[PDB]
Design a binder for this molecule. Structure first.
Ligand code: ADP
Ligand code: ADP
Ligand code: ADP
Lengths: 740, 250
């Protein structure tokens, strides 16, 4: 009676607090259908009743349940539960629920008709006596406990059964936690980073006795870094609450705001107190305020505080039940005596979320906001490039405050204060988000972005041999390195795209980074010129370090000849080969870990002026010439660029291809965009004509770009590439294996 | 009896301390003409009598009144008032006004003939007992309270009615503020910046209980910057006085 009823809890994908999700093999093995009331027994003689639905991404021992039912059963994620199917009641008699005093503060009116009324409508959910569930609305989350269940111990929703529940807030029992706290569900983005932290602190915190039966040292120094406002303390609170370990919080300014001896005593007291209540986590945030760089300690008491922290961190190699996590802003901003083995040896980079992550955070913060239907969070998530989690929290709060300041406060004239049901009847518009996102939110980001890009192979037009070459060079090795070992060949860790300007080098590299499903760190030309002009070429190493903190990557050193082309080009400053930044790139590339899947890709428009020491073997050496596109590729270029715009049937892409030769793809995209510009101008003239009606439903502005626009904007087509350009490119080609 | 008589106070464009400005749709709806003595009831059982004129840049719930009458009615900007038309007296009998000790310091001579003399000339203004108004001149601003109103409780200017008011400075009641202090009218320029600060601190400071019924974090750190001598502390004093919140200065 052990085999079919043991599974392990994990995270959820669904949002309903009553659904539990199991994989298909187990549900056909368990003989279970959809909708069936099932019962879960967990730790401490606790129960949970649940409706079951089917999902895909699980194994045969994983159960996905939301945080509410997980806390209802008195178990935590990664533990085991016992699951038995029961028979159904399919009615109710008279249920009774009470609110909680800890969640209800300053709520006026009655909670019943506004919350519990719309909740149990057409969604058959089972409930048990003595549980805790949560309802969202009116920019709050309210807890309700079921006290009395008349017909069975467990009873499904059944609209004949009205709720009589007009009672006072009942005192929350002191052993159990609220569900408005933080957990793994309340962190948007950071899937990889939560994966690393969850696998790092699973064993020492969940299973403490295991580390008394082996001599193995688990990692005890974790350092979280990332831009400010990215919610690093939130991750620690979450991990603390989800493992159930004691959480102590030290902070930088509070330690530096006390007297000397008293700051020493608090730093000692924190460590000894947290060691008393093992297993624990000690979280020191704003580490760079309490322990900066050596030369940046102008005082004496600062060095005593740093040394006190050092000797306490070295007095922890005896204990295995304490983990210390700290938070900083950048790794080279704290004392290097801390970032050593035994003190702070694991480093985790939180970093900036992306479009999916920004969508995740916006769904977290508007979870109980009662948005309208027209608001499209995808638009916002695409239009918030450069915002971190705190800015999106400020965005949602500011949008709500805009949606409460322009109306329904100055309509509260006959009324004096806010009504509950009035507050619930607060929808937000897309224009409200356009207002909040347009002005008053300065994005706090000037940082390099590292993410998986979004252009794919269907976008670049043509160059299919280059596709089957890049796929080889990037994917072939990392997929299955056994063949390379049998034949003893080192992988190539570089390509050099050379060709005319604007034929799709960046597009190609972003596409090969997309298909490989790896990060993409782009280093522009202006950045290299900045590092040459300011003469601080040291921080180039930082970039590579960043690459190894986000592995796998595709470093893309665009405009690699810009330094040479700014230094007089062919003649100027004596006329040597190498420069500062390119030397530093060589020194950092040669001395890097020979297998990390970090793939360096160059780019250049003038392949001869680059210094010859870069294409020696062991560096980026597999030169690829990006050719000027031809007819069969020009048609693909043109249709791929037009694929986001309306186009009619009379557009002769064949004649367009045949007509335009020696034009780079950039110029064809200029032709397309300028044709769309003329189309836009024509439409605004049509809008002014039909706006200036005779008295002042024939609304259609003809949203179809006719042939006239293309055949007129084609007069503004300019050849950006001469003939001698192609000729010196062929002259560089003959200096390769083609004709030499 | 709720619908026609509820509007919200806002800033003024006119400088006379007796004119109140309403938009054209409301005044044709309310059946009101120019010049009519009207009465305003506000918070704490307080009253205000006012001549009305027409303006353009308002909505149908906005009333523009100067700071003097706004402080006379014991209300602040952004709150609601009740507005009823009354009938006119069109004379006076013997009014009596007194000066305030807090405004009058080191003034020598008599305040009567120099100030109250040119003030009530050819400008028919209604007054009520127990109000506070302000007169400007001689590089000062002097406060005057009306104590006794013989024919009606409210009486319009009427030059046959001379003022007998030769009295000592009367002690300013300690719950009400002077009108030589700072407010939104006493800041020149900065329309956009006052717009941002007024929309930022309207809800947390005027309506405190609202932020106990929702989990929403209002902004709490505001940083004002600009060249020195641009009056940044003045803006804070102003916003403090206009919302009625406690103001601490470090
Ligand atoms: N990934 C995320 N998921 C949810 N909330 C986030 C995320 N990133 C940032 N936030 C929000 O941004 C803020 C981060 O600021 P921080 O100083 O780390 O918080 P704290 O007040 O706990 O110190 C928090 O209010 C948090 O709600
Ligand atoms: N094969 C192609 N398919 C689709 N778009 C292309 C192609 N070639 C060029 N483009 C256009 O050219 C631009 C990219 O130019 P790029 O090659 O990055 O310039 P550079 O060579 O100076 O780095 C994009 O805006 C894109 O629209
Ligand atoms: N926009 C303005 N409106 C009215 N007065 C101003 C304005 N800007 C500056 N001033 C004047 O300039 C001075 C600003 O100096 P400041 O140091 O800010 O004043 P305070 O003495 O209150 O600290 C004040 O006397 C103020 O009267």
């Amino acid at each position: 009676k052990n085999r079919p009823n043991r599974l392990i809890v994990d995270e959820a994908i669904n949002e309903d607090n009553s659904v539990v999700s199991l994989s298909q093999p187990k549900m056909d093995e368990l003989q279970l259908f959809r909708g069936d009331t099932v019962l879960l027994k967990g730790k401490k003689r606790r129960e949970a009743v649940c409706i079951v639905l089917s999902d895909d991404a699980c194994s045969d021992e994983k159960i996905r349940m939301n945080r509410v039912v997980r806390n209802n059963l008195r178990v935590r994620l990664g533990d085991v539960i016992s699951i038995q199917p029961c028979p159904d009641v399919k009615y109710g008699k008279r249920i009774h629920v009470l609110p909680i005093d800890d969640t209800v503060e300053g709520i006026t009116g009655n909670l019943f008709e506004v919350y519990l009324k719309p909740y149990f409508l057409e969604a058959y959910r089972p409930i048990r006596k003595g549980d805790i569930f949560l309802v969202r609305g009116g920019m709050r989350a309210v807890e309700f406990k079921v006290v009395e269940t008349d017909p069975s111990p467990y009873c499904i929703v059944a609209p004949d059964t009205v709720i009589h529940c007009e009672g006072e807030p009942i005192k929350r029992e002191d052993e159990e936690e609220s569900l408005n706290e933080v957990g793994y569900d309340d962190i948007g983005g950071c899937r990889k980073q939560l994966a690393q932290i969850k696998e790092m602190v699973e064993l020492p915190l969940r299973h403490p006795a295991l580390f008394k039966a082996i001599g193995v040292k688990p990692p005890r120094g974790i350092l979280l870094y990332g831009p400010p406002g990215t919610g690093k303390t939130l991750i620690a609170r979450a991990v603390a609450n989800e493992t159930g370990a004691f959480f102590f919080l030290i902070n930088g300014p509070e330690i530096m705001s006390k007297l000397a001896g008293e700051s020493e005593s608090n730093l000692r007291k924190a460590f000894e107190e947290a060691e008393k209540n093992a297993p624990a986590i000690i979280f020191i945030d704003e580490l760079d305020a309490i322990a900066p760089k050596r030369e940046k300690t102008h005082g004496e008491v600062e060095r005593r505080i740093v040394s006190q922290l050092l000797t306490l961190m070295d007095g922890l190699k005896q204990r295995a039940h304490v983990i210390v996590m700290a938070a900083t802003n950048r790794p080279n901003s704290i004392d290097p005596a801390l970032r050593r083995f035994g003190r702070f040896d694991r480093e985790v980079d939180i970093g900036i979320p992306d479009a999916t992550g920004r969508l995740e955070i916006l769904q977290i913060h508007t979870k109980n906001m009662k948005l309208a239907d027209d608001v499209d969070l995808e638009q916002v998530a695409n239009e918030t490039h450069g915002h971190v989690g705190a800015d999106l929290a400020a965005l949602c709060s500011e949008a709500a405050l805009q949606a409460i300041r322009k109306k329904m406060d100055l309509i509260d004239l006959e009324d004096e204060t806010i009504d509950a049901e009035v507050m619930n009847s607060l929808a937000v518009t897309m224009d409200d988000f356009r207002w909040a996102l347009s002005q008053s939110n300065p994005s706090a980001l000037r940082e390099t972005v590292v993410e998986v890009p979004q252009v794919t192979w269907e976008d670049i037009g043509g160059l299919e041999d280059v596709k089957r070459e890049l796929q080889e060079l990037v994917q072939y090795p990392v997929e299955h390195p056994d063949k390379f070992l049998k034949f003893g060949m080192t992988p190539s860790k570089g390509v050099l795209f050379y060709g005319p300007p604007g034929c799709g080098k960046t597009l190609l590299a972003k596409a090969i980074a997309n298909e490989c499903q790896a990060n993409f760190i782009s280093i522009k030309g202006p950045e290299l010129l900045t590092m040459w002009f300011g003469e601080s070429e040291a921080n180039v190493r930082e970039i590579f370090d960043k690459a190894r903190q986000a592995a796998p990557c595709v470093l893309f050193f665009d405009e690699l000849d810009s330094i040479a082309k700014a230094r007089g080009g062919n003649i100027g400053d004596g006329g040597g080969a190498a420069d500062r930044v390119i030397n530093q790139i060589l020194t950092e590339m040669d001395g890097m870990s020979t297998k990390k899947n970090v793939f360096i890709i160059g780019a250049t428009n003038r392949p001869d002026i680059i210094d010859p020491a870069i294409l020696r073997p062991g560096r980026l050496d597999q030169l690829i010439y990006i050719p000027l596109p031809d007819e069969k590729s020009r048609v693909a270029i043109l249709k791929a660029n037009l694929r986001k715009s309306p186009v009619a049937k009379d557009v002769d892409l064949e004649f367009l291809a045949k007509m335009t030769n020696g034009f780079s793809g950039a110029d064809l995209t200029e032709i397309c965009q300028r044709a769309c510009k003329l189309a836009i101008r024509e439409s605004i003239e049509s809008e002014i004509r039909r706006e200036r009606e005779r008295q002042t439903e024939e609304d259609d502005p003809v949203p179809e770009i006719r042939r006239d626009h293309f055949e007129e904007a084609m007069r503004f087509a300019r050849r950006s590439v001469s003939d001698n350009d192609i000729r010196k490119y062929e002259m560089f080609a003959q200096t390769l294996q083609q004709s030499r």
